[PDB]
Amino acid sequence: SNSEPNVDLENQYYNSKALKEDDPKAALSSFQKVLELEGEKGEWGFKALKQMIKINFKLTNFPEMMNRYKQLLTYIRSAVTRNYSEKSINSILDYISTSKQMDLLQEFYETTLEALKDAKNDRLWFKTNTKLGKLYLEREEYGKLQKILRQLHQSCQTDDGEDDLKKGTQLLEIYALEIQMYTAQKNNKKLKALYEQSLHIKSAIPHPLIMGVIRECGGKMHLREGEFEKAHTDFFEAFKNYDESGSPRRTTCLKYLVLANMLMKSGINPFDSQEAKPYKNDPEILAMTNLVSAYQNNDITEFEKILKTNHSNIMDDPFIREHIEELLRNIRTQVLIKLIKPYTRIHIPFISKELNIDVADVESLLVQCILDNTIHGRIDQVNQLLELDHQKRGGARYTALDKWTNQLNSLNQAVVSKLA
Template sequence: MSDVEDDFMCEEEEDYGLEYSEDSNSEPDVDLENQYYNSKALKEDDPNAALASFQKVLDLEGGEKGEWGFKALKQMIKINFKLGNYKEMMVRYKQLLTYIKSAVTRNHSEKSINSILDYISTSKNMELLQDFYETTLDALKDAKNDRLWFKTNTKLGKLYFDRSDFNKLAKILKQLHQSCQTDDGEDDLKKGTQLLEIYALEIQMYTAQKNNKKLKTLYEQSLHIKSAIPHPLIMGVIRECGGKMHLREGEFEKAHTDFFEAFKNYDESGSPRRTTCLKYLVLANMLMKSGINPFDSQEAKPYKNDPEILAMTNLVSSYQNNDINEFETILKQNRKNIMDDPFIREHIE
C-alpha cells in the first residue's frame, strides 16, 4: 500500500469530530453509523457490494447532508478510483463537494479534500486529473479556502508543465503570484513558503524553455527568500534548475554546488531525482576538470555503486584518461542510462 493510500485510509479512522452543539442535544444517527461501518467492512472483499451499501448511507440521510454521508462519499470516490470507474468517481466527487459548505466543518472538509487530491494525483491519466483539479477549483470559488485553492492550482500547474502546455501554465502562475502579493503588487514575503512553490514551478518552465535570462532572475529571487520553511523537494527543484542554468553558462563550479545541494534535498525528501542529480554532479565534475571525487562526501558515498551512477563515473574516467574507445564503448552499453536524459545528451554529444 502506498503512503498516500495509507494516509487516505488512516484519515478515515480519525474522528474529525462529529461535532454536535451542547444546546441542540442531537445524537449521532446510529442507523447511519452502523450502515457506514457495515459498508466499510465489505470494501476489501467485495467493492461493488460496498458501493451499493454506501449508497444506502446516502439514502438513509434522506437529503439531509451530514457527516456520515460525507464519509460514505469519500469511500465511494476511493473505491471507484481503484476500480477504474472514473466517470462514476467524478459524479461522487461533485456530490461530495456539495457537502463542504454546511454538512462538515471547514477543517474536516479541507483535510479530506487534501487527502483525496493527494490520492487521485497518483493517477497517470492526465485528462482525469485536469477534470478533477478544475472541478475542485470551481467548487472552491464560493468556499473562500485560500490554502486549498493554492494547493489545487499548483497541482494543476504541475500537470500543465508535465504536458508542456506552457500557455495554460503561465495563466496559472499569474493567478498564483497575485495570491501572494501585497496591495502594492509586490511579493508578500510573509508568504515565503508559497512563493517558493510558485518559483519552483516557474523555474521548471523556464528551464524547459531554456530561457536563461528569466530563469536567472527568478533563481536569485528564490534564494533570497528567508521567511520560508520550504519542503526539501521544492528546494531540490530550484537548485537542480540553478545547476542546469549555470552549466549552460559555463559556470561549472556553481553548477557543481547547485547539483550537490539539489541531490541532498532530493535525498532528504526521498525523491528518485537524487540519482539524476548525482549524474549531473558527475557531469559538472568532468566539465570543471576537478580532481575531487564527488563520492568522497558522506551523503553521496552510498550511491557510488548504483548501476546508473557507475556508468556515468566510468564515462567520466575514460574522458579524463583520453580513452576515446572506452568512452564510446561505455556510451554504447549504457545509452539508456546516459543519453536518454536530454540534459546530459546536450553536453556530451
C-alpha cells in the same frame, strides 16, 4: 481525553463498509440512507458521500456522482475541518483518474476548482493548482500553465507588492513550475530572473522536491555563468533533496555535482562519501567514480582512457561536453605542475610525451601557468626549453640593506644641506 462522536452513524457506516463487497446497488442505497439518518451535514455521512462516489464510479454513475461531489465540496467548508477533506478529495480525484474519460476528468477538475475558489481554501487551493501545473509540465502544456501561474501570482500579490511574506511557499511552488517550464524552453535570462526572485522571496518551508529543483536550476545557472562554488553548493542541496525524496533526477543531479566539484580545483572528491557501495558501484555512476579517482591520482592517461571509453555517458550531456575541455586543461595543468615541482630546467618534448599531447599545447599551458604566477620559471622557445628560476639564494636582505643605505644617506645629505 475521549469524546462521544456518535454510535449509530458509525455503526451504519461500518455496516455499509461491509456491504461494499456485496452487490453495489445495496451499498449505494445504504450509504445514501446514512446521509438521511443525520440529515444536517454528515461527519460520518461525509465519508459516506466519498464511498458513494467510489461505488458510483464502479458502476459508471457520474451525474449524481458529481452532484454529490459538489455536496462534499460544500462539506469541506463545513464542520468537517479542511484537514482530512483534502486527502479525501485527492483520493476521489485519483479514483476518477482510473478511467480514461478526459472530458469527465476535466469537468470534475473545474468543478473542484470553482468550489475551492468559493471556499477560499487558500493552502488547499494552490496545492491543487500546483498539482495541475505539474500535470501540465509532465504533458508540456503552457497555455493553461501560464494562466495558473498568473492567477497564483495575483493571489500572492500584496496589491502594491507582487509578493507576500508567508506566501513564500506559494511563490516557491510558482517558481518551481516556471523553472520546469523554462527548462523546457531553456530560456537562460528568464531562468536567472526566476532564480533571483526565488532566492529573495522564497524564504519559507519547502517541499524537498521543489527545493531540489530550484537548487538544480541555480547550479545550472551558476555553472553557465562560471561560479564553481555556488554551482557546487546548489547541486549539493539539490542532490540532498533528491536523496530524501527519491526522484529519478537523483542520478543526473549527482553527475552534475560531480562535474561541479571537479571544476572548483583545489583537489576535492565528490564520489567519496555518498557514492559508496550503493552509489559508487552504480553502473551509471561508476564511470564518474573512476574519473574522479583518476582526478585524485592525477592520472591523465587513465582519465583520458575513461573519457574515450564511456563517451556515451561522459560527454553525452552537452554541458559536460562543453566543460570537458576545461576539465582536461585543469587536469593537464595539475599534472604538469606536479611533474615540474621537484626540479628545474626540463625540456619540452619530454613533458609532451609524458602528457601525451602536442608540443604546442604544452607550450601554451606553460605560458598560461607562468602568467598565473604558478611557475617561477621562463621559457626558451628557440631550443624547446623551460628554464626555472631556482631562486635557491633565498636572500633579498641585501635589497633591504641597499634601500636602507641610500634612503638614509640621502636623508643625511638633505639634513646637512638644510642645517647649513
